[PDB]
Write an enzyme that holds these catalytic residues in place. Structure first.
Site, short mmCIF file in Angstrom:
data_model
loop_
_atom_site.label_atom_id
_atom_site.label_comp_id
_atom_site.label_asym_id
_atom_site.label_seq_id
_atom_site.Cartn_x
_atom_site.Cartn_y
_atom_site.Cartn_z
N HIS B 69 -2.80 9.69 -6.83
CA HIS B 69 -2.20 11.06 -6.78
C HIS B 69 -3.28 12.13 -6.95
O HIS B 69 -3.46 12.64 -8.05
CB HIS B 69 -1.10 11.17 -7.85
CG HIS B 69 -0.24 12.38 -7.71
ND1 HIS B 69 -0.65 13.62 -8.18
CD2 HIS B 69 0.99 12.56 -7.18
CE1 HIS B 69 0.29 14.52 -7.92
NE2 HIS B 69 1.30 13.90 -7.31
N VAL B 75 -5.04 14.56 -9.43
CA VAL B 75 -4.33 15.58 -10.24
C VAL B 75 -3.11 14.92 -10.91
O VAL B 75 -2.37 14.19 -10.22
CB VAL B 75 -3.94 16.78 -9.36
CG1 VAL B 75 -3.03 16.37 -8.20
CG2 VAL B 75 -3.32 17.89 -10.19
N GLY B 78 2.87 16.82 -11.64
CA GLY B 78 3.71 17.77 -12.41
C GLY B 78 4.97 17.10 -12.95
O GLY B 78 5.30 17.36 -14.11
N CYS B 79 5.58 16.21 -12.16
CA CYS B 79 6.81 15.48 -12.52
C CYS B 79 6.62 14.67 -13.80
O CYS B 79 7.61 14.54 -14.55
CB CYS B 79 7.30 14.59 -11.38
SG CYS B 79 6.30 13.11 -11.15
N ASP B 83 8.36 15.08 -17.25
CA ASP B 83 9.03 13.91 -17.87
C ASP B 83 8.67 13.79 -19.34
O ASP B 83 9.55 13.44 -20.13
CB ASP B 83 8.77 12.59 -17.18
CG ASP B 83 9.94 11.65 -17.42
OD1 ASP B 83 11.05 12.02 -16.97
OD2 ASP B 83 9.74 10.60 -18.11
#
Lengths: 170, 170
Positions: B69, B75, B78-79, B83
């Site tokens: 990723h 990076v 964001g998820c 979480d």
């Protein structure tokens, strides 16, 4: 805009940077990739007439996230279903031929009102592109739903993904 | 309510079901676990006077998500920062002594306005509990921020987590 459906191998090629070219939108590779195939992509139609994606993820009990999430209580993380929707909006921006790397910028309302158990067959993503903006930074806004074996379980309104070129710090 | 700080080993024990007991709130195990330590948890104070969590994740270039990723563009998703905030609200409900398994129910607005590069040292989560509801189903509502090395990069308003007992289908 060339191709309206993608196999797993197309998406793996996308994850390597070899579908839209290096420095353009990439899907993640396993284990962050949350799509097996794109069944439909278009820049017209959808809920808002600004385009649509339909994508699928096959479920089996051996997918990595079931063992660690949670021990004795396997369930697909909602955050990874949400991420599939960001992945697909990023893919859409690259597919339109815009340059730059994809970043999720956020969402309005997210709702999880069902779950993916290791007994499920197939998760389906429906993305409705609402707007693209071609300012300083290129971005897309979309609504999305996640369904498991026919049944709607997640919704997101105002999914935002932005493209960052070689000169764009974040 | 017994303990106000937790080491990685406390959180691994939580992931096994051995902190709050089986059928109660669990953190995920690696690789879905997005917390190394809880520095502060309380049921008073915070932004809304209804409690607060402060938690940390150490960053190094070898964390699994950096490689996939994305290839050539590492990076933190964001998820997974989002979480961590759901994980901490779930931990809070278990820590109060409520029974049942944690599910994320969604959020209001999520914004990503910065990124975690593999050169970062430390991600910090700040969770402000807004309300707990003890109806039919027990749930918590919170605001959260994610910071990397002092700098705010994500926000979420109206994070919702619910507890599901042995009789509760979802």
């Amino acid at each position: 805009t060339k191709q309206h459906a993608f196999t797993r191998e197309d998406l793996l090629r996308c994850s390597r940077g070899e579908l839209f070219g290096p420095g353009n939108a990439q899907l993640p590779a396993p284990n962050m990739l949350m799509i097996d195939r794109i069944v439909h992509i278009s820049d017209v139609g959808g809920k808002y007439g600004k385009g649509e994606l339909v994508a699928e993820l096959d479920i089996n009990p051996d997918l990595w996230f079931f063992a660690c999430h949670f021990e004795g209580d396997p369930v697909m993380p909602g955050c990874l279903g949400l991420d599939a929707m960001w992945q697909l909006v990023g893919f859409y921006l690259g597919w339109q031929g815009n340059p730059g790397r994809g970043r999720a910028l956020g969402s309005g309302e997210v709702k999880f009102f069902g779950q993916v158990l290791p007994t499920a067959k197939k998760v389906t993503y429906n993305i409705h592109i609402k707007r693209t903006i071609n300012r300083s930074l290129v971005l897309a806004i979309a609504d999305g739903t996640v369904s498991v074996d026919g049944r709607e379980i997640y919704s997101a309104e105002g999914l935002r993904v932005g493209l960052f070129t070689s000169t764009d710090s974040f």
